[PDB]
């Protein structure tokens, strides 16, 4: 039976939890598309004690017009396909986050910040995100990095130079990232235009067509439960669906999702039987052709990037296949990935598949551990004055960050 989600927690703090040693403790801000995750670096403690503000990245303002609201509670959100592209709907998302974390007082946030961004970020987008940050909030110095690569940095066996493929899958994108000597080989990195949002959207539209008698009973927040709790990824889809074909297996494995009641009441207050549907929603990232979409999918793409290298460095970078982010949470994901990988390697060769320690939070914990180390490496950060000579389309090439290129944007 379905549950309902929680809302409106009580995060309130003093003006700044400044510890011993250096006073400018940075904010660690994972600016996610599904949800934002934000908090103080809190140095000198091994386990990250409190990743506060776990909240959905969505805002309310309706037919009333005169007000808007920002916490977990018609709706809007600041992103287009995992790049932020909104003005004040970004501000009132930052404002919520700062106010609930506490801030000093004066006409700026006194603390430096580390902020996640898109695997590639359009130059205009980076420029705007820098302007909307330095101008309005007055931050002293800033760092941009990629969610996935922070999660890798967290999960590495050692704080040392590495190579691998990162497999990442968030709200509206999945990416395959080849990395060599700690550097993202962004020349031949690739992404797929699908993700967990689109899975839920498909599972919704399926069950709407299965039970037209009660369109209103099924809605995204209930699709979330069946997709998180009750769905799994096949080892081989055309074989799973084949064992699902016989009634004696079906009845033993179909999921009985009881709606809340007011004929045994199921003619409207149905038990929403999900069978094959609990496979067809996860599978979208491996076979986007279950939707209309003609793209290679996470299987053909991995082969298509992996055959663009010399045969020795393939055998190097496949030694660390890493799973992180959103959709990798499905049960069975490691097994499907390592089976699909076994067919596309030399007959006796070796590979290894690692799953992130906490697939959803390790991006933030990574950004924490990174900033807490690189406090004083002033070649890594963008300082407030640099933004006055370099127009905002500028970045500092540390590991776990997008590849910079010399370029400039006309503005007046």
């Amino acid at each position: 039976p379905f549950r309902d989600a929680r809302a409106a927690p009580d995060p309130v703090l003093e003006a700044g939890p400044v510890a011993h040693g250096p006073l400018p403790v940075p904010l660690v801000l994972d600016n996610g598309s599904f949800q934002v995750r934000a908090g103080w670096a809190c140095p000198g403690q091994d386990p990250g004690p409190e990743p506060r503000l776990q909240f959905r990245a969505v805002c309310a303002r309706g037919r009333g017009g005169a007000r808007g609201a920002s916490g977990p509670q018609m709706l809007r959100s600041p992103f287009d396909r995992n790049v932020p592209v909104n003005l004040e709907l970004q501000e009132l998302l930052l404002d919520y986050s700062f106010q609930h974390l506490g801030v000093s007082s004066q006409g700026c946030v006194d603390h430096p910040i580390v902020l996640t961004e898109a695997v590639c970020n359009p130059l205009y987008s980076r420029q705007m995100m820098s302007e909307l940050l330095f101008e309005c909030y007055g931050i002293p110095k800033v760092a941009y990095g990629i969610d996935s690569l922070f999660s890798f940095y967290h999960n590495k066996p050692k704080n040392s130079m590495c190579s691998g493929l990162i497999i990442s899958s968030g709200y509206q994108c999945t990416h395959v990232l080849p990395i060599l000597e700690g550097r993202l080989d962004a020349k031949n990195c690739k992404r797929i235009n699908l993700g967990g949002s689109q899975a839920a959207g498909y599972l919704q539209r399926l069950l709407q067509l299965k039970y037209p008698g009660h369109l209103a009973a099924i809605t995204l927040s209930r699709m979330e439960e069946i997709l998180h709790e009750h769905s799994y990824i096949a080892e081989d889809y055309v074989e799973e669906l084949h064992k699902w074909r016989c009634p004696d297996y079906y009845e033993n494995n179909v999921h009985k999702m009881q709606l809340p009641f007011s004929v045994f009441n199921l003619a409207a207050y149905h038990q929403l039987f999900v069978g094959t549907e609990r496979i067809r929603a996860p599978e979208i990232i491996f076979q986007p052709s279950l939707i209309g979409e003609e793209q290679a999918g996470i299987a053909e793409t991995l082969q298509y990037i992996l055959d663009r290298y010399p045969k020795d460095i393939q055998e190097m970078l496949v030694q660390n296949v890493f799973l992180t982010g959103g959709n990798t949470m499905y049960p069975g994901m490691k097994a499907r990935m390592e089976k699909e990988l076994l067919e596309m390697r030399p007959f006796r060769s070796s590979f290894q598949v690692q799953l992130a320690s906490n697939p959803v939070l390790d991006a933030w914990y990574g950004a924490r551990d990174w900033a807490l180390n690189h406090l004083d490496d002033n070649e890594v950060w963008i300082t407030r004055k640099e933004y006055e000579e370099k127009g905002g389309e500028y970045l500092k090439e540390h590991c776990a960050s997008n590849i910079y290129v010399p370029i400039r944007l006309p503005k007046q």
Binding site: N193, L206, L209, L241, G275, R280, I291, Q295, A296, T301
Partner: protein, 62 residues
């Protein structure tokens, strides 16, 4: 220029209304199905859910 390439292989053909493998497609509704009971089922659907299923696959349906 980071977009993944189109797939090389031809697409598998799963049934609309159950997801099982579909040997067959109906010449009038243009949905696709696996068995006789599924062909009995589809013929009893209204136009709205028929175009509704086709729209999941960006088929001719607009």
């Amino acid at each position: 220029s980071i977009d993944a390439p189109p797939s090389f292989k031809p697409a598998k053909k799963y049934s609309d209304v159950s997801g099982l493998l579909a040997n067959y497609t109906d010449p009038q509704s243009k949905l696709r199905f696996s068995t006789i009971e599924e062909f009995s089922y589809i013929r009893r659907l209204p136009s709205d859910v028929v175009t509704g299923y086709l729209a999941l696959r960006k088929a001719t349906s607009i």
